[PDB]
Every structure is written in C-alpha cells, then in structure tokens.
Design an enzyme around this catalytic site. Structure first.
Site, PDB file in Angstrom:
ATOM      1  CB  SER A 179      -0.942  -0.008   1.208  1.00  0.00           C
ATOM      2  OG  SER A 179      -2.104   0.763   0.928  1.00  0.00           O
ATOM      3  CD  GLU A 300      -5.161  -4.244  -4.313  1.00  0.00           C
ATOM      4  OE1 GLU A 300      -5.319  -3.861  -3.134  1.00  0.00           O
ATOM      5  OE2 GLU A 300      -4.062  -4.637  -4.758  1.00  0.00           O
ATOM      6  CG  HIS A 389      -5.643  -2.607   0.008  1.00  0.00           C
ATOM      7  ND1 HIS A 389      -4.632  -2.502  -0.921  1.00  0.00           N
ATOM      8  CD2 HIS A 389      -5.311  -1.776   1.022  1.00  0.00           C
ATOM      9  CE1 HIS A 389      -3.731  -1.636  -0.491  1.00  0.00           C
ATOM     10  NE2 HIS A 389      -4.119  -1.179   0.686  1.00  0.00           N
TER      11      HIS A 389
END
Ligand code: ZN
EC number: 3.1.1.-
Length: 467
Positions: A179, A300, A389
């Site tokens: 991320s 995600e 995610h």
C-alpha cells in the site's frame, strides 16, 4: 551469544527467542522534535552505554494501545539463530495511506520470516501525516518535503552501514512494502536520497503516487491557516503541540472536498527530494539492474467500500477519473465506470492499484528482471469472499492470527517461499512455481491462490482500454 551489537552510534543488546535474535527500538535518527520538526532526518546522538533493545519505540502520532510520540524513528531487527553469516536482508516499509501504521504492528513481526527463510528482517517507523507528509518547502528552504520518504531512506542507509554487525549482507538488501509502503518504494527506486541503498524491491499493492508541487503548497497553506500561523510566525511550527498538528490534520483530511481516490497525504513533486514522477524516472532507467517483484490483489477496492457505503456522485466521480488518468483518458475510460457502487469499487482497484502496478512493471521491464503477480485467494462464503486490499500480508509474514486451516498455512508457505527466494536470488521461483519473467510482449503473470496458476496478459481488454 548475549547479542550485544555495536551500531555506528552505540551498543544495543537484544534477546533470543524461539530461534530468532531480536533487537527492538534501535534509534536510527535524532528524534524529529522541536527545531528538528519539518527537517530532514539527522544522526542520533551517540551513547556510551548498552541500550536494552528489547522493546519497541513509540510510533508516529496518528488517529486511533501502543505509545505515540514524534520521537518515533526506530528500526527493529529479526535474525535467525544460525551459524550462517552474511544473510540476505529484507527491509519492510508499512502502508497506511501515509498517515497510519508502524513497523512494529503485530502483523509485521519478522520472526517467522527470519527463521523460515534464514534471512534478516528489518522493520521501521517513518514520519506520517502532518509530521512526514506536510510539505513546507514553499515556506522555508530549511524545511524538506517528503520527510517520511527521507526517513525511510535514512533507515535504509542505517541498514547499509550497520546490518553487517547483525549478521546481514549490506549488498543484498531487498526493500519490500505494501500500500503506502509500495508507493513509497516506487519513489525510493528513483529518489536521489535512496541511490544505491538496496538491490532488489518488492511492491505490493502500490506504485507511482504523487501530488503536484502546486497541490503540496496549497495544502501547506491551508494547514498554516488552521494553525493560525502566518509567514512571520514560522518559528511557532516548532513549538506548537503535536496534538494541534494532529487536530489540524484530521480537520483538513476529512473535509467534504476530500475523497479516498485523492490521498490527502502522499509524496509530492519537489526539485530537491523527488524531481519527477517515479514512474517516469523508472521508464528512463533510474532503477537499472534492480530486480522487481510487483503485484496487486484481485479485489482491492472491496476493502474501502461496504455494501451500504456512500454511492458515487458523478461530480466528484468524474473528478476522480481525470485526476487518476488525465482528462483525455478519463473521457475514453468513463464508459467502464457507470455510476454505481460496483463502479467506484472497480475504480479503486483499477486506477489506484492495478493500472499503476502494470505501468510500473512495464517501465521497469526494460531495465531489470520483473515478476508480476495477482493475489486471488479468499474464503468462498460471504461476507469475506473477496481478495481484499492487504489480504496477502498475513501470508507474506506468516503471521496468520489476523485470519487457520492447513490450506491457509499452505498458501502462506507458498507465498513466503517465493518472497524469500526472490530476496536471495532476484528470481521468485520455487518448487511450487516456475515464475515467468514479466515483459511487455507477453505479460505473463502468476496468480497466487491455493492452487497456483499463470495468466498471460491478464485482463487484456481492460489493459487496452486503460492504456
Ligand atoms: Zn554473547
């Protein structure tokens, strides 16, 4: 074997548990407090005694049990208790949209990875939110922009200069992150401050991400307004309470005109620290010869939008498309995201993660080995039946409590094994998977799941539309 190690600033003593030597809370920079706030990381003052490095240092102040403090620049080291020397070193850069997280979060405990791969794992904290991603260069040349990234670079420099004393090979350092951590690495691979600080990179759900120099200045001005500080009162930026900065930060970040598609905190273009878009730099060979393992999860966006969450607003919606693709492409791609919950979720997956990852992998493929994956795993039954995610993190680190069946442990072994072989050789292949190199002619991609598969030029239709 009592683990006293001499760092360039003084001795630290760790401990040994379950076959892993551990050092926690090692200072790698002077606490960025007071006059050092908003300035590039400096070397910490040397100490003459032995630091009991068995406890994590404070984490950077952030919205919320661990202690918080601007005095948060610490690294942690996990090494296997084995006679083997000069070990590969894996340095973790945590995510959290540039205002949340810590290298000391339980999910990132590097003991299992260290023991299983016989590699050294380093975790760390870097300045966040108003402390690390509030770019004040436009107000004083003494201040540095992209402070959080400079901290990461300083930590990597610390690794280069000190890891041999912990049994690591400073010439075989793999930086990995997810991320915001992946987006940070995208920048570190091109930044002047990080030149030659690592030899391999792993970018999980994150790639080139920056705000304009103009936007950075705009936000900076807004911050000072909230703080009631004008251009003749900059001295107060060093005496104002940290809590006041956190307060101003939340106020502006949560502002109605702010959305998840446009990160309030993120790296900014700056001649001194980040001259141009990471992706562009990479496309011109900035990271020549540095092997890259990069990927995303299939679903995600489902982590950011719930079945009953806010539903678009074409206004802010079209604005997102132009911001993430440019006006010309936004118009050509608008067709793909008709206003709906489904579309906003797909926009997040496609434009904040997938397109950037493919663009970065494609650019780097002309200068170094590149390996791409897509993580598809998830339980079959709702409501957790999405490859959300960050879902690959527990598998990478082997810290599965966040999820434990034999298939879960099996998938973690498969994924962690690949990350380890990559750190050791620059090729993520294992006995479970002969990983094909990723290049623009075939775009061969490994699909991570209980059963490993390979897709050539996955989502080609979407690729042709977005590119
Ligand atoms: Zn000893």
């Amino acid at each position: 074997t009592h683990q006293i190690v001499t760092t360039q600033y003084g001795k630290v003593k760790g401990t040994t548990e379950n076959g892993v030597h551990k050092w926690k809370g090692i200072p790698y920079a002077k606490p960025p407090v007071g006059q050092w706030r908003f300035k590039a990381p400096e070397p910490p003052e040397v100490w003459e005694d032995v630091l009991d490095a068995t406890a994590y240092g404070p984490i950077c102040p952030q919205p919320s049990l661990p202690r918080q403090s601007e005095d948060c620049l610490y690294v942690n080291v996990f090494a296997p208790d084995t006679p083997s020397q000069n070990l590969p070193v894996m340095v973790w850069i945590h995510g959290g949209a540039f205002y949340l997280g810590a290298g000391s979060e339980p999910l990132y405990d590097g003991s299992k990875l260290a023991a299983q791969g016989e590699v050294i794992v380093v975790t760390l904290n870097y300045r966040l939110g108003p402390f690390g991603f509030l770019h004040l260069s436009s107000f004083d040349e003494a201040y540095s922009d992209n402070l959080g990234l400079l901290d990461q670079a300083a930590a990597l420099k610390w690794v280069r200069e000190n890891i041999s004393a912990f049994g690591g090979d400073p010439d075989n350092v793999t930086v990995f992150g997810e991320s915001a951590g992946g987006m940070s690495i995208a920048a570190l691979l091109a930044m002047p401050a990080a030149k030659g600080l690592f030899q391999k990179a792993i970018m999980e759900s994150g790639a080139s991400r920056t705000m304009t120099k103009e936007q950075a200045a705009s936000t900076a001005a807004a911050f000072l307004q909230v703080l009631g500080i004008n251009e003749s009162q900059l001295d107060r930026l060093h005496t104002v309470a940290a809590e006041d900065l956190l307060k101003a930060a939340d106020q502006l970040r949560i502002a109605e005109k702010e959305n998840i598609f446009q990160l309030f905190f993120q790296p900014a273009l700056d001649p001194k620290t980040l001259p141009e878009e990471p992706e562009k730099s990479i496309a011109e060979g900035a990271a020549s010869g540095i092997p890259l393992l990069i990927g995303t999860t299939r679903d995600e966006g489902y982590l950011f939008f719930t079945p009953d969450s806010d539903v678009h607003s074409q206004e802010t919606l079209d604005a997102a498309l132009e911001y993430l693709l440019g006006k010309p492409l936004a118009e050509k791609a608008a067709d793909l995201y008709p206003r709906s919950l489904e579309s906003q979720i797909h926009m997040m997956t496609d434009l904040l993660f997938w397109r950037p990852a493919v663009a970065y992998a494609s650019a780097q493929s002309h200068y170094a080995p590149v390996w791409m994956y897509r993580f598809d795993w998830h339980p079959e039954k709702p409501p957790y039946n999405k490859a959300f995610h960050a879902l690959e993190l527990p598998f990478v680190f082997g810290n599965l409590d966040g999820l434990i069946t034999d298939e879960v442990k099996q998938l973690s072994h498969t994924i962690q094994s690949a990350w380890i072989t990559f750190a050791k050789t620059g090729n993520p292949s294992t006995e479970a998977v002969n990983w094909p190199a990723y290049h623009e002619e075939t775009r061969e991609t490994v699909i991570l799941d209980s059963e490993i598969t390979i897709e050539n030029d996955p989502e080609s239709e979407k690729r042709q539309k977005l590119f």
